[PDB]
Design a protein around this nucleic acid. Sequence first.
RNA 1: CUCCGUUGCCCUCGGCCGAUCGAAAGGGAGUCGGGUUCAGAUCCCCGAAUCCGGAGUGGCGGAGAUGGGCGCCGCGAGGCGU
RNA 2: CGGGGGGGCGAGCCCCGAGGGGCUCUCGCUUCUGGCGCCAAGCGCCCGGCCGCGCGCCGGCCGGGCGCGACCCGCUCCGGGG
Lengths: 57, 238, 119, 49
Amino acid sequence: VRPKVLMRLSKTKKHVSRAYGGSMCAKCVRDRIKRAFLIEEQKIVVKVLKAQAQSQK
Amino acid sequence: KVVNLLFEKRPKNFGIGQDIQPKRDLTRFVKWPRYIRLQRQRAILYKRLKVPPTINQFTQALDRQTATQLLKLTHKYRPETKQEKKQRLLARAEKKAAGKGDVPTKRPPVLRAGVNTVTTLVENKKAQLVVIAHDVDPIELVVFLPALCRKMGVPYCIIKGKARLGRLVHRKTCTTVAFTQVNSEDKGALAKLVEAIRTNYNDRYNEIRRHWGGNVLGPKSVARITKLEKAKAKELAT
Amino acid sequence: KKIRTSPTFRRPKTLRLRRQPKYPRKSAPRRNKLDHYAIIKFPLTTESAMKKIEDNNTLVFIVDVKANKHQIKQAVKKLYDIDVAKVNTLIRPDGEKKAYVRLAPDYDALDVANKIGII
Amino acid sequence: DPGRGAPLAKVVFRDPYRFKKRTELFIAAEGIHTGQFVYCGKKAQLNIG
RNA sequence: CUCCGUUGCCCUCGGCCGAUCGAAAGGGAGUCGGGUUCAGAUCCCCGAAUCCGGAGUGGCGGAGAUGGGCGCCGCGAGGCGU
RNA sequence: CGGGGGGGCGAGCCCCGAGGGGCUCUCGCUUCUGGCGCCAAGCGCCCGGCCGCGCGCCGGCCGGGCGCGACCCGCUCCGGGG
Ligand SMILES: [Mg+2]
Ligand SMILES: [Mg+2]
């Protein structure tokens, strides 16, 4: 519905109750979860591979 | 353990592309307005260019030890303030019609402020000590005075601040100042400053008139030109 | 040592005071000229205005061209000891501003018309 | 863009001074695709884009 | 002068991007049916609506919230203390 | 930015007592994936109020301030010409 109408409508009509709800499509949310996972996990892996490369040298 | 286990560290690291950078001082990276940017690189052109000696003598000045005595000597001779001049006339209008006032009284010795008051009584050999402020805006006004001084055998000095010299006389600024006479008791300190000054200023003109005062590069440049003289040195010194 | 975090120099926010006039610029206040007797010129008695009175419970007025609907309501209320439901203005060709004034349901227009002398 | 034979590319960095997202328009080198990481600067490595 | 409002000053925060004008066919919330005049009607009347702003003191209900545990007292529904 | 100085994983060279130190370089630390990123943690040093020990720069409760974190000094905002 035309944008200035979103002022009359209620909160639940404008979103959907999730993370990033009403702004992202939940096929790209469930990716942004398990992408924000392994980015951190392989930062831990490089952290210990860097801590073993300096422990060896 | 008086430490709640939750207080951890979260230390940030501001490497390039790492966590966002914090706020440091930037006073050397600021878009300053066209009047600041002007007056700062006015004081640079005043160092980069080769300055003539007569404008340059006003850079070298008196020191904390000499200037404080001068500024103490004058505090016994400040010209009558207003409302202090009022009681010099008012007390004479009552003393005249009551107690035998001839009213010639001996005007106590005081300073003299302006340029075309001093340059008259130095051209007349009528001044013991002349004090020159170093920062007069049209330097034209005092460019000549030191040479006029030592040609008449009068001890001149260059002190810092046209403000604090214009603070003995009750004004905002004042370029010169001069003692014509001094009280007999104050004669000791006057003769002491005099010899200490003309040893540094009057008997020095053939070092001042032949002294140019600029030609220094900026340190960003000096570090570069001297870094090629550790290369040329270590080329035929090793 | 108040470090400059932004590389811009926005001018500092100086104090500025209020006007303290030694004299009033003009002596006396201009007396108001859209009054309750100069906002209502004269009521219309047209056959298509009386037909508006007895049927619609309104009154037709000619009214000074500078008048608001709020201004017209507060004057019709001030003069004829009346009370107004809503005010409808137009501007006739010839430039005189008509104003159909709808009186509240408890108030009768065929009566207050006789007081103001129109019929 | 109209009037130009080359395609442009909206490349999103993030300003390393204030929390924000600077966005540019680079004349796209042939091979650039959507989602590629474009690196910039002196320490960057030599490959397309 | 409760608490709230207002204002004065001190600290704190604030990128823009251009003073302003430019569409009765672009962008732009919300009105429809019946009736009425000699001439006006989505504009008058009747009947249904509707948006935007205000609603402070909050006008009223509803939501936030009405649990659980423990401990007693009570046949039990239950009551109290924590 | 230019000098400096810090730092140090590390490399070249010099010194070395094998602990380390000096000169040079490297760095100012982010490269597999359409992720997140600010308004300071942590530490230090103080002060106001309140409570407790009472000697209160002792300890607790409430509330603030400055320094390190985020190295120091400068003279052209940084570059390219002249
Ligand atoms: Mg919904
Ligand atoms: Mg306009």
